[PDB]
Design an enzyme around this catalytic site. Structure first.
Site, PDB file in Angstrom:
ATOM      1  N   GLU A 167      45.350  36.965  39.358  1.00 37.53           N
ATOM      2  CA  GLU A 167      44.760  37.119  38.049  1.00 37.53           C
ATOM      3  C   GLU A 167      45.544  38.171  37.250  1.00 37.53           C
ATOM      4  OE1 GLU A 167      41.210  38.516  39.688  1.00 37.53           O
ATOM      5  OE2 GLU A 167      40.243  36.542  39.768  1.00 37.53           O
ATOM      6  N   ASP A 219      31.942  32.309  45.308  1.00 34.09           N
ATOM      7  CA  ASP A 219      32.819  31.605  44.371  1.00 34.09           C
ATOM      8  C   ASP A 219      32.678  30.089  44.512  1.00 34.09           C
ATOM      9  OD1 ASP A 219      33.720  34.086  43.586  1.00 34.09           O
ATOM     10  OD2 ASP A 219      35.246  34.199  45.152  1.00 34.09           O
TER      11      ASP A 219
HETATM   12  C1  R7H Z   1      41.634  41.188  55.760  1.00 31.91           C
HETATM   13  C2  R7H Z   1      41.132  39.948  55.051  1.00 31.91           C
HETATM   14  O1  R7H Z   1      42.131  38.983  55.049  1.00 31.91           O
HETATM   15  C3  R7H Z   1      42.114  37.971  54.085  1.00 31.91           C
HETATM   16  C4  R7H Z   1      43.002  38.336  52.926  1.00 31.91           C
HETATM   17  N1  R7H Z   1      42.886  37.310  51.911  1.00 31.91           N
HETATM   18  C5  R7H Z   1      42.347  37.446  50.617  1.00 31.91           C
HETATM   19  C6  R7H Z   1      42.519  36.177  49.992  1.00 31.91           C
HETATM   20  C7  R7H Z   1      42.086  35.842  48.578  1.00 31.91           C
HETATM   21  S1  R7H Z   1      41.803  35.747  46.763  1.00 31.91           S
HETATM   22  C8  R7H Z   1      41.403  34.570  45.466  1.00 31.91           C
HETATM   23  C9  R7H Z   1      40.425  35.224  44.424  1.00 31.91           C
HETATM   24  O2  R7H Z   1      41.088  35.760  43.276  1.00 31.91           O
HETATM   25  C10 R7H Z   1      39.374  34.253  43.883  1.00 31.91           C
HETATM   26  O3  R7H Z   1      38.398  33.891  44.850  1.00 31.91           O
HETATM   27  C11 R7H Z   1      38.552  34.960  42.753  1.00 31.91           C
HETATM   28  O4  R7H Z   1      38.071  36.117  43.440  1.00 31.91           O
HETATM   29  C12 R7H Z   1      37.001  36.850  42.849  1.00 31.91           C
HETATM   30  C13 R7H Z   1      36.843  38.176  43.570  1.00 31.91           C
HETATM   31  O5  R7H Z   1      35.706  38.751  43.466  1.00 31.91           O
HETATM   32  O6  R7H Z   1      37.855  38.719  44.257  1.00 31.91           O
HETATM   33  C14 R7H Z   1      36.102  36.282  41.969  1.00 31.91           C
HETATM   34  C15 R7H Z   1      36.548  35.034  41.191  1.00 31.91           C
HETATM   35  O7  R7H Z   1      35.691  34.075  40.673  1.00 31.91           O
HETATM   36  C16 R7H Z   1      37.360  34.170  42.244  1.00 31.91           C
HETATM   37  N2  R7H Z   1      37.842  32.946  41.673  1.00 31.91           N
HETATM   38  C17 R7H Z   1      37.939  31.721  42.388  1.00 31.91           C
HETATM   39  C18 R7H Z   1      38.469  30.472  41.616  1.00 31.91           C
HETATM   40  O8  R7H Z   1      37.570  31.666  43.544  1.00 31.91           O
HETATM   41  N3  R7H Z   1      43.116  35.344  50.919  1.00 31.91           N
HETATM   42  N4  R7H Z   1      43.347  36.043  52.071  1.00 31.91           N
END
Ligand code: R7H
Ligand code: R7H
Ligand code: CA
Ligand code: CA
Ligand code: CL
Ligand code: CL
Ligand code: CL
Ligand code: CL
Lengths: 472, 472
Positions: free
Chosen positions: B328, B53
């Protein structure tokens, strides 16, 4: 020849944990102001039930028309009514606390700016979760009311009429134009002509509505040399950002800028906390200011905004750094146009910030002076000219505790640096908050917090200064 | 009777960790839009160097004028130039990531709203300290620039001319009206006529200036059915509050409200984090919206604002509760005027919020449907009518992981309650983000993430299906 008067008591605390003659156990938080007419206004917290920073507190003043000998009777600026159904009266009242006084030199209007909380423990009882306090509806900002078991935001609109979340008028109304003495009726909640409760009550309520549990900033003004005072105005929405948790005054006496491109601006010391670290690592000094003679107010930036600390930039809204805090402060303008802010903090010595744009932003570096002790307590400082030379007098505790009030004298260099020309004691024993004023004719006055003989914290007294006592 | 077409690959990732023929390793984040002209617009992140990302990511679309059989060439909306001096090219570019497409049915303008970050690791590289990104100067809001070794805020004003903290024009200017293909020149920093660097670069800089390190929201628009795109507009200052850390889209396809008092309102799903718990406890869904055909944008409230969780009210700005997060989301309007927000979360099943006022505020209680699993991944949902009855179609992974794409059909009952009727597989194996559209004449299209045959995360494919496939 040091011409210091003797401790003259202005607000008399009770004795040995007992109320005084008027039923007032404690007084705190001195503010001292010399008006254009020459009169002195001494303001304080009238803490009826205990010394703590909450409870039933009135904002009050006494005036002396003869430069500090005859202090007249109490004038109550504001004292909100207590919740008559609170189980614990000691935390059973809407709170007003901590005052800053200042006068506009053109209009002569005098201002009292002070904190307000709904019923509870004030700054020590703030919730971990934000409640929205205001809502803008078609260009107009209204205060929100919450009703038990409903999620939506009611609003207090014209004439105090309460409107539903959907925007429909109701039969409920708030007293927004209080009329009783000390405006004890502010916030009363009516249905029709029937009094039900008060929107500032938070427990055992008899009406359905309350404001957000949050920190607020109120202001009152007097146009007759402080004899009579307006109803409080809620200036919070003009200056409080959405991230701020606490926002309150650095108690004492503000200033009006006398020179430079921002001449006529009123400066009021304040400080904030954020929701990341609140009172443990985010207390941060700034000013608020008015350029239109107190009609509207704006927030400066924090000293801690984009400040470098241990190689990394912080921001007052995100910091978590106990040592980088600065809290209650006192503000002075120099002749070169600069604004100096002397800030209570936790380094052990005196911390000072400099602004080149009239208090809106602050320069990179906080200057520390080990020549002046700071035991983490409020201070005051004023500008004064003597024999064509520019000086600052600053008063605070000498230490090691809140004891041994000293007065520190500094010469103002051309470039704005401070040179401390030795320090003379002014009060032994307990010494806490204090407020200086130049009296004119080479003289200075001070209203300060002090106890002896088992007096309840604190009794507020007045002493006098001569230019010779300051030096040598 | 039931018809599902065969997988048509629209954006084709590389295989076995290698770039594809065009030099692109990865595609992600589908958005699918049927325009007034009948065209299908398929949007995606073009992730050149890897699947993560962040990095060198372009906002791209392809168009199909024949209901998804053949597809035209890639059209790049936005693709900021890389920092050529970055040590690690994989984190060495200003980032665009995640788009929402929507078309205004009156003006026919097509909007792509997507996230923006300066050079770094996007949402996973955000700083613990706030930097102010904007400054309002006599009613006009300007983007801030920070200069090496200096604390004050420069501003980017008219024609891109950089102003000093004190308000004096300089010889530096920013390309605010980019002209190169994909607007790769946006943010270029010139002194006179000499290109020095770029304000979105954060390492090994060749110019003195950069924007605030923060999360931003940008918008580009097309008036010719998606063939050509305006320069990006920075819509952040319209919607991002001062407490917000991350603010970004819930990618997919937004809606225009078709009935009720806010007919014509454009809704865009977004979510935030706060500085209290950021990604660990504060992700919170909301919408932003436009009432003037996309000229200006406003934030609705969060679903989590004044929500009760275990007896205690929370707020999106102060919450720290992993289970109460919603991230989302995909948004639907019912025929009774209500808005439904289907929200990615961490309960294992589908969470749905309801708004009665066109997306601005959300009702007390979030409805959970155990009939639809949610394995913590984006979803899409659309309104649809069949033979006079009202339905919602929702597509997401069936589980246990991001695998086994499902299409769920729900009947919309009298009161706005949902009854889940059918659950049908649409893609075996890996399945993650997706975007649905009604094609007309009882048919539906879907653009979605999937891999097979050693394809890199992901290839974006398109299928068309019919009511019999859905209702079976
Ligand atoms: C046991 C592990 O422990 C950790 C738990 N954990 C999980 C989190 C985070 S989520 C935030 C996500 O919605 C976000 O990255 C989005 O995700 C996507 C995906 O494939 O899931 C793709 C998309 O482009 C991306 N968009 C951005 C702007 O980055 N924080 N802590
Ligand atoms: C060991 C745990 O580490 C945490 C350290 N720590 C530091 C603190 C902070 S202080 C914030 C103080 O400026 C504030 O309470 C003021 O105090 C007054 C005073 O006599 O000191 C009097 C004044 O009326 C009051 N004003 C209000 C609105 O209440 N609490 N814990
Ligand atoms: Ca009271
Ligand atoms: Ca790029
Ligand atoms: Cl009440
Ligand atoms: Cl192509
Ligand atoms: Cl650069
Ligand atoms: Cl209608």
């Amino acid at each position: 020849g040091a011409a210091l008067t003797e401790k003259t008591d202005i607000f008399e605390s009770g004795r040995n944990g007992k109320p005084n003659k008027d039923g007032i156990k404690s007084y705190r938080i001195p503010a001292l102001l010399k008006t254009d007419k020459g009169t002195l206004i001494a303001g304080a917290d009238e803490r009826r039930l205990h010394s703590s920073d909450w409870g039933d507190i009135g904002m009050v003043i006494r005036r002396s028309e003869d430069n500090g000998k005859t202090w007249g009777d109490r004038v109550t600026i504001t004292n909100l009514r207590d919740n008559p159904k609170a189980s614990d009266p000691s935390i059973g009242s809407p709170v007003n606390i901590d005052m800053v006084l200042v006068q506009d030199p053109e209009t002569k209007r005098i201002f009292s700016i002070y904190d307000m909380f709904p019923e509870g423990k004030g700054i020590f009882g703030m919730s971990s979760q934000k409640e929205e306090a205001y809502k803008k509806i078609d260009g107009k900002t209204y205060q929100i009311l919450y009703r038990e078991g409903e999620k939506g935001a009611y609003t207090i609109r014209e004439n105090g009429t309460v409107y539903t979340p959907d925007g429909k008028a109701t039969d409920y109304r708030v007293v927004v134009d209080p009329v009783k003495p000390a405006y004890s009726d502010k916030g009363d909640l009516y249905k029709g002509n029937q009094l039900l409760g008060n929107i500032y009550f938070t427990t055992n309520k008899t009406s359905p509505f309350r404001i957000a549990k949050d920190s607020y900033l109120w202001m009152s003004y007097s146009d007759d040399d402080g004899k009579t005072w307006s109803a409080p105005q809620d200036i919070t929405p003009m200056v409080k950002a959405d991230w701020m948790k606490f926002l309150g005054v650095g108690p004492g006496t503000g200033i009006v800028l006398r020179n430079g491109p921002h001449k006529g601006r009123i400066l009021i010391p304040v400080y904030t906390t954020n929701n990341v670290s609140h009172l443990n690592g985010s207390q941060s000094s700034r000013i608020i200011y008015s350029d239109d003679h107190g009609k509207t107010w704006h927030a400066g930036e924090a000293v801690n905004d984009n400040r470098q600390v241990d190689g990394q930039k912080i921001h007052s809204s995100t910091m978590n750094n106990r040592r980088a805090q600065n809290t209650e402060s006192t503000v002075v303008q120099l002749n070169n146009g600069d604004v100096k802010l002397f800030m209570r903090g936790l380094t052990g010595d005196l911390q000072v910030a400099t602004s080149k744009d009239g208090g809106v932003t602050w320069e990179k570096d906080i200057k520390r002076y080990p020549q002046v002790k700071d035991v983490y307590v409020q201070m005051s400082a004023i500008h004064t000219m003597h024999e064509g030379k520019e000086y600052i007098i600053l008063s605070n505790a000498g230490g090691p505790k809140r004891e041994n009030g000293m007065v520190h004298l500094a010469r103002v260099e051309e470039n704005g640096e401070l040179t401390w020309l030795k320090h003379n004691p002014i009060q032994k024993g307990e010494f806490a908050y204090n407020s200086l004023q130049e009296l004119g004719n080479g003289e200075y006055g001070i209203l300060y917090e002090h106890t002896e003989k088992g007096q309840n914290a604190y009794t507020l007294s007045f002493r006098k200064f001569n230019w010779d006592f300051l030096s040598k």
